[PDB]
Design a protein around this ligand. Structure first.
Ligand SMILES: Nc1ncnc2c1ncn2[C@@H]1O[C@H](COP(=O)(O)OP(=O)(O)OP(=O)(O)O)[C@@H](O)[C@H]1O
Ligand SMILES: Nc1ncnc2c1ncn2[C@@H]1O[C@H](COP(=O)(O)OP(=O)(O)O)[C@@H](O)[C@H]1O
Ligand SMILES: [Mg+2]
Ligand SMILES: [Mg+2]
Lengths: 49, 528, 570, 109
């Protein structure tokens, strides 16, 4: 009985891929917002005040 | 009213008897839906070939027919656009609705317009294929033959040329002669999916249709194209394919008692195709001011260009695009043989910017092929060996193209100029690099507020070397450099990439904010 | 309500529905090899010589959504497919036209009409009665009101001047129903499987009538989008067969087309659970009898409808076999809503019969002496195979190429319609490689990204590249010796050899020749095996182990067993 | 008129088939780039919509498969105001936020 059962490949691929797309998009948007704030902080001070 | 009686029905032809003034290709009506055309006639009878078929109409000896006394004329209806029709006008698949008012009626064998009604071919026709648009140009009013073996991509090339007119105001007419209905429905679906359905018509005569319909389908398509040309419109016609049309004509003539000639074809097979393909060209403002571009398709057998019909068709058109089976087997798509392909119009059919950009590329390609086939010993001449082995491979990488992928004319020209200025030396067979470059240039030239004006300048006028260098250095190169350095890791250490892109202005700060605002991957100033 | 749900099912329907019964793994572990093999043979998965592998195959088949759908529906009251646009039978008429033969010749007879209630139509059938036997003559040309020309559909013996003939002004018709399965007939419906000629119960349909309200209806079709699974490694991996399209089987004589045809019939009937129509055109009597007998023996006879236009019959009768088969397939799709796999053999003989009929009726021959209507007739035959809301009609047609001349007009006409071409090689067969399919020459339009995955395309491309490269390098090996290769070239050659031999497969029908049991390999198993071989994982195994196996694990197990025996022997 | 120049920039896409749709009507607070997931054949676009009449923030995903659908999806930017009709897709059962397909849409920028 034990040797017969095995891990499927269709549902696993679909679910894994969907979670990877969501995690990738979330990570990219976080990195974009941090990069832009770093650019803003690089050129944001008055010369004379 | 009826004035003819059917006497015999043999050889798929009908033998009408009656006293009438018959004329060649005069419509004879057997019902309100079924009609034929007169092929041969004498002072008491005629031989008619049917164009239709009706299930409830049972034609037989003794049936009555009416000789309308008018030549075969195709009527023009408003709902032709975005529709599949047959040679008599009936809409087999339609997207809009008809009004039952004929805009015009065009005679199918309309004689070609004389010499004084013509004009020079000087305006490009965009086919969406970089190799064709740069090395084998097609002008508005040209006749270019697509010739090759089976399953090599001739129909794909024609459909690609017909997709590039999405935003050019060029009407599309696609004539299918003995094609499968599955493929025609698929082509209709592709037209709808690629936003050119409202601009296109499909004339269809299936492989099991009446022989007269398959014979006269290209002429009906040309009559519709002539209607559209008479109101100053540029029409692009594709015939798929003319070998089936030659077979249909041979079958019709053999079944009518005409003697066979060379290869069993009738004696006037050359005239049938020449008087058909001579109706295309560019016409003067007083005679319509439009143009008709024809892309007939021909099938060879195992590369045999020397066949009867293929050599008849080569001696009529203004050049040919030859598709090779060896390249198709090797995986090259589109499999177009540059060595055996010609465009007699040449740079006359290219815009000034494209003529400047693609000048002397065929020579370099032939030199690269000559070197590749004859490298022989490992001894190397000079750095020029590396120069050729670099630029030829860059050109070959530029050749490849996905199916149904439309590459704009200016994008192709800019790619050619980048290749000639050595801005593709870093390439090491990474398709995503050219995909990124093409997408960036396309979006910049289509949507950017200043890129749109740059594209208009490139289309209309002919710029010189210094202005092009300024354009490339101050706008195009910073955008390309940023969008390449943020997708290709190996470009960080690629010695050629730094050697060429070191002095280019960095523009990451602005393109970042453009990305974060949801802008496309080519906007550099703003949306117009 | 078991009684109510079983009340809507006939006993034969319950017998069939016993196949789609779900077995738990706890039960399945308790079966024996014999019961597991019986289950696999009943479900078309082929014999298995291992226990756990057999359970895994049965579970994979059972876990499929289609199998579960059928099993769930089998416990519900019968739902009837409501036929939209059915085939309407012919109308009931009387014999309205009468006449007699006035001119005789070889295969062509002229009929003069005396008493007619209505004017004669083209392609109608005249019946003659000679010595209690009925002869059908199809009308070709109507010269005038009372004079037509006809050609025989069958045998012309017994016809003479003055033989009275009568006609209903209708084309030839055949009796079609579900009872046609398991029977062997000819294109005009004569019984061919017994001497007493037990009739076929059904309605009379005219195969030459398409019954379309308008031409636009012929454009309501669905372009092919699905791939049929055959269980053959080479076909599945490299030459996917469209569902609703056309596949040509090309080659010379003796390459092995008929064995492939029988295997595909069996696989479609058992594994895919469908209805098969065979249409033999110019079918040899010995081959027809043999195929009928093996259909009875192998158990796919009761779900196959055979039409045989024999080689010895008149060309007019041989021409109608394809049309009759197409009509049977159209009935089985439109009236019953069942997917049909239609088999045609041989297309070249259909073209030849058309050419013969054209030449007999005094028509001017076309190039190479063929009929002027060659492409038109080929289109007429092939355009009725399609895919509609009611179901799919898949066609697998065998062709004979004379002297390997692929530019022959018959072949050029045939390639205009084929959606996938499978080309067999006599050299490859002579090397003992079966099914002897040439992977480099053959190609399929369905091996794209529109229908297959990225992995399948990558595997197919790498396989074709490796096979071409090893074919190139074999000549160098033969001439200069295996040492002259480089280090990478030796590995490429070994991988290519193992790939080429792994593509061979034993069929469940070919047990007569070699005596080896057949196998059924799923697409995933073939992909995994080819992926294992491409990486060079099995490069330590002799090539002789890769021949005529089912899956990648069999080679490994056999090599391990041989190594164990060698270690024990010393 | 403030909205006079917005009229010339209207872009309307529609299907002649009518299914059950979820209607969104509001401004696009944030929209990301596009991702290709199903064998590089589809386009995935995450959208943040501030609705009209409630001014609440909702998160959705949009799927594009054809050339015309991708062209319509590329017209959506930040601060774009949309009247979008979206057919629910059965892949949301494995997603945090629903996945939709554009049936009808009107885009102004
Ligand atoms: N650029 C391309 N990239 C990939 N596949 C392509 C490309 N162009 C064409 N194809 C494929 O090549 C095959 C042949 O294309 P097509 O049908 O246009 O050729 P053809 O010469 O008209 O053939 P036929 O003999 O069937 O009329 C098709 O499967 C098509 O999808
Ligand atoms: N898979 C196979 N295994 C073994 N022999 C085969 C196979 N396929 C074909 N053959 C051989 O082909 C012969 C019959 O040829 P046939 O199938 O009629 O080819 P064709 O119809 O192409 O002429 C048989 O004697 C048989 O040995
Ligand atoms: Mg084609
Ligand atoms: Mg055979």
């Amino acid at each position: 009985i034990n040797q017969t059962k095995e891990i499927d490949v269709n549902s696993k691929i679909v679910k894994t891929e969907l979670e990877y797309v969501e995690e990738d998009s979330r990570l990219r948007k976080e990195k974009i917002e941090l990069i832009q704030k770093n650019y803003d902080n690089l050129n944001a001070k008055p010369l004379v005040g | 009213m009826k004035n003819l009686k059917i006497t015999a029905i043999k050889d798929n032809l009908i033998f009408v008897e009656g006293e009438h003034q018959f004329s060649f290709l005069e419509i004879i009506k057997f019902s309100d839906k079924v009609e034929g055309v007169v092929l041969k006639a004498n002072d008491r009878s005629a031989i008619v070939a049917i164009l239709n078929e009706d299930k409830d109409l049972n034609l037989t000896v003794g049936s009555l027919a009416e000789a309308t006394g008018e030549l075969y004329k195709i009527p023009i209806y408003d709902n032709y656009l975005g529709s599949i029709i047959n040679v008599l006008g009936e809409s087999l698949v339609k997207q809009y609705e008809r009004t039952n008012v004929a805009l015009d009626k065009k005679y199918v064998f309309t004689e070609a317009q004389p010499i004084f009604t013509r004009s020079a071919v000087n305006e490009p026709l965009v086919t969406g294929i970089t190799v064709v648009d740069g090395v084998l140009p097609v002008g508005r009013g040209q006749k270019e033959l697509i010739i090759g073996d089976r399953g090599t991509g001739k129909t794909a090339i024609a459909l690609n040329a017909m997709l590039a007119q999405e935003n050019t105001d060029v009407i599309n007419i696609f004539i299918a002669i003995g094609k499968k209905r599955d493929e025609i429905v698929e082509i209709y679906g592709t037209f709808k999916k690629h936003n050119i359905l409202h601009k296109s018509i499909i004339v269809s005569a299936a492989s099991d249709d009446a022989v007269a319909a398959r014979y006269l389908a290209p002429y009906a398509g040309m009559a519709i194209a002539e209607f559209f040309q008479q109101i100053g419109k540029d029409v692009l016609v594709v015939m798929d394919d003319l070998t089936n049309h030659a077979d249909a004509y041979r079958e019709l003539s053999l079944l009518a008692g005409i003697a066979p000639a060379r290869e069993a074809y009738p004696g006037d097979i050359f005239y049938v195709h020449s008087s058909l393909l001579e109706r295309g060209g560019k016409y003067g403002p007083e005679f319509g001011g439009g143009s008709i571009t024809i892309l007939p398709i021909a099938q060879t057998l195992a590369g045999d260009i020397s066949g009867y019909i293929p050599t008849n068709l080569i001696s009529i058109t203004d050049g040919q695009i030859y598709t090779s089976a060896k390249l198709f087997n090797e995986g090259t798509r589109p499999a177009i043989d540059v060595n055996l392909s010609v465009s007699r119009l040449g740079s006359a059919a290219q815009s000034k910017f494209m003529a400047f950009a693609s000048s002397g590329l065929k020579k370099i390609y032939t030199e690269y092929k000559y070197l590749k086939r004859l490298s022989s010993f490992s001894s190397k001449i000079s750095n020029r060996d590396l120069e050729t082995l670099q630029k030829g491979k860059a050109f070959e990488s530029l050749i490849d193209q996905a199916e149904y992928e439309v590459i704009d004319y200016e994008t192709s020209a800019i790619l050619f100029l980048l290749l000639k200025k050595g801005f593709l030396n870093f390439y090491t067979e990474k398709t995503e690099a050219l995909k990124v470059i093409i997408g960036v240039i396309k979006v910049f030239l289509a949507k950017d507020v200043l890129g749109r004006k740059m594209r208009a300048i490139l289309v209309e006028h002919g710029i010189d070397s210094i202005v092009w260098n300024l354009y490339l250095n101050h706008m195009i190169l910073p955008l390309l450099k940023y969008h390449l350095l943020s997708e290709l890791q190996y470009l960080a250490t690629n010695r050629e990439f730094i050697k060429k892109f070191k002095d280019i202005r960095n523009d990451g700060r602005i393109l970042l904010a453009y990305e974060r605002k949801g802008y496309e991957r080519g906007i550099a100033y703003d949306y117009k | 309500d078991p009684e109510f749900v079983a009340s809507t099912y006939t006993e034969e329907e319950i017998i069939h529905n016993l196949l789609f019964k779900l077995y738990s793994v706890e039960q399945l572990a308790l079966f024996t090899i014999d019961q597991l093999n019986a289950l696999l043979f009943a479900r078309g998965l082929g014999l298995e010589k291992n226990k756990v592998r057999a359970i895994k195959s049965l579970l994979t088949l059972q876990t499929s959504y289609e199998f579960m759908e059928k099993s769930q529906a089998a416990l519900l009251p019968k739902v009837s497919f409501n036929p939209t646009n059915p085939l309407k039978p012919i109308e009931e008429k009387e014999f309205t036209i009468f006449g007699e033969i006035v001119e005789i010749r070889s295969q062509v007879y002229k009929i003069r009409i005396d008493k007619a209630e209505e004017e004669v139509l083209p392609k109608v059938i005249f019946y003659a009665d000679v010595n209690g036997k009925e002869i059908q003559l199809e009308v070709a040309d109507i010269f005038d009101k009372n004079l037509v020309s006809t050609f025989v559909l069958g045998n012309e013996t017994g016809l003479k001047i003055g033989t009275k003939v009568k006609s209903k002004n209708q084309s030839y018709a055949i009796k079609i129903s579900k009872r046609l399965l398991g029977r062997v007939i000819d294109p005009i419906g004569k019984i061919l499987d017994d001497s007493i000629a037990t009739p076929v119960h059904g309605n009379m349909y005219a195969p030459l009538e398409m019954q379309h309200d308008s031409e636009a209806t012929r454009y309501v079709v669905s372009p092919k989008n699905a791939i049929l699974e055959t269980g053959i490694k080479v076909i599945d991996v490299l030459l996917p067969i469209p569902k609703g399209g056309k596949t040509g089987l090309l080659g010379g004589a003796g390459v092995g087309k008929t064995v492939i045809v029988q295997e595909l019939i069996n696989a479609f009937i058992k594994f895919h659970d469908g209805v098969s129509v065979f249409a033999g055109i110019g079918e040899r009597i010995r081959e027809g009898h043999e195929l009928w007998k093996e259909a009875e023996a192998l158990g796919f006879l009761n779900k196959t409808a055979f039409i045989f236009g024999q080689m010895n019959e008149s060309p007019g009768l041989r021409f109608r076999s394809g049309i009759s088969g197409v009509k049977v397939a159209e009935y089985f799709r439109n009236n019953l809503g069942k997917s049909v796999l239609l088999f045609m053999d041989n297309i070249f003989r259909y073209v030849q019969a058309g050419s013969e009929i054209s030449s007999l009726l005094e028509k001017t021959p076309s190039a190479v002496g063929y009929q002027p209507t060659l492409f038109s007739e080929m289109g007429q035959l092939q355009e009725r195979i399609n895919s509609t809301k009611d179901g799919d009609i898949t066609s697998i047609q065998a062709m004979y190429i004379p002297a390997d001349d692929f530019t022959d007009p018959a072949a050029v006409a045939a390639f205009a319609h084929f959606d996938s071409t499978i080309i067999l090689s006599r050299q490859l067969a002579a090397e003992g490689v079966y099914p002897a399919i040439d992977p480099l020459e053959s190609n399929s339009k369905m091996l794209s990204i529109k229908y297959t995955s990225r992995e399948h395309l990558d595997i197919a491309k790498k396989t074709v590249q490796t096979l071409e490269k090893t074919k190139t390098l074999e000549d160098i090996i033969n001439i200069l010796g295996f040492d002259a290769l480089s280090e990478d070239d030796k590995k490429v050659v070994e991988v290519g050899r193992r790939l080429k031999w792994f593509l061979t497969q034993p069929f469940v029908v070919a047990e007569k020749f070699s005596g080896v049991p057949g196998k059924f390999v799923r697409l995933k198993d073939s992909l995994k095996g080819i992926k294992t071989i491409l990486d060079g994982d099995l490069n330590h195994i002799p090539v002789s182990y890769f021949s005529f196996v089912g899956v990648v694990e069999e080679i490994i197990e056999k090599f391990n067993l041989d190594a164990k025996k060698e270690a024990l022997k010393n | 008129n403030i909205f006079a120049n917005k009229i010339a920039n209207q872009k309307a896409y529609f299907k002649r088939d009518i299914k059950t749709v979820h209607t969104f009507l509001g401004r696009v607070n944030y929209i990301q780039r596009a991702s290709k997931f199903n064998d590089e054949k589809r386009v995935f676009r995450p959208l943040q919509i501030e609705l009209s009449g409630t001014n609440e923030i909702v998160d959705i995903y949009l799927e594009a498969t054809t050339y015309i659908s991708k062209k319509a999806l590329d017209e959506i930017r930040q601060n774009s105001y949309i009247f979008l009709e979206a057919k629910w897709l059965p892949e949301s059962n494995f997603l945090n936020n629903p996945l939709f397909e554009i049936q009808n849409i009107v885009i102004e920028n």
